[PDB]
């Protein structure tokens, strides 16, 4: 069966650092164009980052520079390095496979993230 | 001025050599883009041993991807420009010519691939891309994608989705006699600096009257004084 | 007064016949000649081994074109042209085509220096003649290869694609071609009014 | 002196793709705009695809639009036609025709024809 | 400034066709392809419509998608109770080089 | 979609003049050039004309002919028992932009 399962979500202090991870089964993360999208409670999916087959990355405006997406060599799993958080990064991050640039076919369940003391 | 242009995934490469390249005629449908990387576009008096013209049809928003050190759908998988490109990415709208409704499926681009393109690599192959554990078996299916996808141009779309024909000229310099010298006019009968392909000097150039045999490109008088010279561009003594 | 690879005046150059074309060494270039009424000496093959093991070269003056290739065919032990008798297979790197090179006396000088081949030539209308003639440059082939052994080709009638003609075969019209090896010397050339060499003085013969 | 070799001809099942890969010999390839013309047994010719010297396709027959992809390499002196999603009617013998022009569509005459290869699509 | 605009809510009774309109600047929706996603409560977005008209992998029928100029439209014949979710519209804004999503409609059955 | 219309079959005694009419419309024959092809059984078709009159070297002089209007015609004489074959009229289209071909007419020597 196809499935993407993500872990790494919990409370964290402002300015902290996390390694969220996206684990892929039935699919191969080192090939299909993979995407990290978010949705703060009561809000709208916002594109965070897309990883291309060839390694190229794209990030949104608000999430530029601080963050990083990466693709494991052999574990069949992808990871977001979230650094320099603020109040507007409270989220339920999802990892999703996106045929090309056209539509996002498969969505992971969801990994809460909180920025508070 | 060719009637039809190659798809972006099978770009051509018309090698050009042993001629005089007049770069002015290229200035002209409105050339919405004419950039150059490595050489100043404004006013052609250099000699290159080879000019490669790579010509294709890319949509408007992706003309910005034909540029050194740029990434995306076109530069990664279809046409990869190197990091030290020397040449001029010319482009122009072609919604009149290349945007029919009988020719929907004449223009395809490579949407999937396993690794970025090595600079100036063309892949025409159409192997079913495997994006899953199960084998594709040579037939497209779930997690088994056919790479090439069609532009399907229409005449009513925007100016950002309309076929911007593109030509990439690369000028190349080997340790071989350069022959693509495309016309600088230089004054005669008056003391003038002359720079013949690095042969630098100062003097009065006059219509020669000595018979150089076709294998001779210089002229020496007694005591090795340079008495006559031929132009490496227009071959004048 | 030029010092370069010249043929020492009054050397004794080897004589050959057609009425056997063995491989020869290529020391510092070669002065090659030919005397015949109808073209029998068509082309040459060059290289350090003249086989598929290493890179090699073929020059041939065909009926209407000269073809120059450097791509290391599996040359037959008795290369021959009637075509395709010489070469067997090859992946080619350089290629060149031009007009044909030529009771007549051909002449050539092959010298390979700094990764550049150089061919000179002088076709004349005619025991080498006692006269004198300077060899105008013909081509300068930029190709980075080693050349230590060369062998000529012929255009006789009866022969086998396999090396079956050993010490015997078709006896065609007499075609005598001469071969001398160039030494590094220093001549004092005499250019005349239009720049046509008319004499030369060997600076160590006498 | 102009021989046009074929390839890729053999029974293929009703849904699998195929690759017919014509060749060439004895003439300048990148000067001439090649073609691909099929003929069903017991019927006349049916144009299938064209191409030019710049590998800018001309267009496919109406029945085979969006399922045949024609390309070429002037270096390997070839002309490929990757059939996708075949059917029963696509069985035919495929000549790798030729055009004297390089523009293909001012009313051209196709000079040299390969001997062709037979593609049969049945269970 | 391109971010597609979508009505805050749309409501209809069962048996009445429901129409949702996603409008945006022609930089992203006039030159690229819309796609439409459905988010059931407490779950993850499920693709609903792709490539401006299609319906993938046997989605329940009567779901329709269309594109008119710089706008996109989703349609559901009748308003079934199970269809209650949030609906989003997404296009690849090349000017921002970013996926852009709509506001999201709270479909409520009357 | 206009289609070229050759006669399905033709029969004639040896020696007479044989007419093969390829009928079309303005877009196909009324505006461009038509060429004719000869096919023997189990052979690859070969050139027999071009430019509506001219002949490739070797082209039978006995088979020649040009016509105006929307139709083209081929004329044949000295029918040898070997001249039994199928003749195709080839044409380009200016509007639909796809090369058209004739159905094919078979010649019989009685
Ligand atoms: C020719 O083929 C040989 C043997 O496969 C290979 O070693 C060599 O690199 C090839 N050379 C060229 C010029 O392709
Ligand atoms: C010729 O031989 C020399 C000495 O071994 C070697 O260094 C050189 O590479 C050879 N030339 C070529 C073209 O390989
Ligand atoms: C040089 O050319 C001139 C003019 O053609 C001629 O009169 C003279 O004899 C030539 N000298 C030689 C023999 O080189």
Residue numbers in the entry:
A (entry chain L): 1 to 117
B (entry chain C): 343 to 370, 372 to 386, 388 to 527, 531 to 584
C (entry chain A): 50 to 68, 80 to 142, 157 to 176, 187 to 210, 215 to 294
D (entry chain N): 1 to 123
E (entry chain M), F (entry chain O): 1 to 110
Provide the publication's sentences verbatim:
The S glycoprotein homotrimer on the surface of SARS-CoV-2 is critical for viral entry by binding cellular receptor angiotensin-converting enzyme 2 (ACE2) and mediating fusion of viral and cell membranes. SARS-CoV-2 neutralizing antibodies bind the S glycoprotein to block its interaction with the ACE2 receptor or interfere with the pre-fusion to post-fusion conformational transition of the S glycoprotein required for membrane fusion. In this study, we characterized the previously reported F61, which was isolated from convalescent patients infected with prototype SARS-CoV-2, as a broadly neutralizing antibody against all VOCs including Omicron BA.1, BA.1.1, BA.2, BA.3 and BA.4 sublineages by utilizing antigen binding and cell infection assays. We also identified and characterized another broadly neutralizing antibody D2 with epitope distinct from that of F61.
Cryo-EM structure of the Omicron-spike-F61-D2 ternary complex provides further structural insights into the synergy between F61 and D2. In the S-D2 complex, each up-RBD was bound by a D2 Fab covering the solvent-exposed outer surface, resulting in an epitope on the RBD spatially distinct from ACE2-binding site. In the determined Omicron-S-F61-D2 ternary complex structure, three RBDs are all in the up position, and each up-RBD was bound simultaneously by one F61 Fab and one D2 Fab. We utilized the Omicron-RBD-BA.1/Fab interfaces for the following structural description and analysis, due to their better densities compared to WT-RBD/Fab interfaces. At the Omicron-RBD-BA.1/F61 interface, N417, N477, K478, R493 and H505 have extensive interactions with F61 residues E26, I28, Y33, Y99, D101 and F102 from the heavy chain, and N31 and D51 from the light chain. Structure of Omicron-RBD-BA.1/F61 interface indicated that despite close to twenty mutations in Omicron-RBD-BA.1, F61 could still interact with these residues, such as N417, N477, K478, R493 and H505. Furthermore, F61 also formed salt bridges with R493 and hydrogen bonds with N417 and H505. At the interface, 11 residues from the D2 heavy chain HCDR2 and HCDR3 interact with 13 Omicron-RBD residues. The interaction around S446 at the Omicron-RBD-BA.1/D2 interface is between heavy chain K65 and the main-chain oxygen atom of S446, which could explain that the binding of D2 to Omicron-RBD BA.1 or BA.2 was retained at pM level and D2 could still potently neutralize Omicron BA.1 and BA.2. Due to the distinct epitopes, when F61 and D2 are used as a cocktail, one antibody binding to the RBD may help to induce and fix the RBD in the up conformation for efficient binding of the other antibody. In this way, the F61-D2 cocktail would be more efficient than individual F61 in fully binding the S trimer and blocking all ACE2-binding sites, as shown in the Omicron-RBD-F61-D2 ternary complex structure.
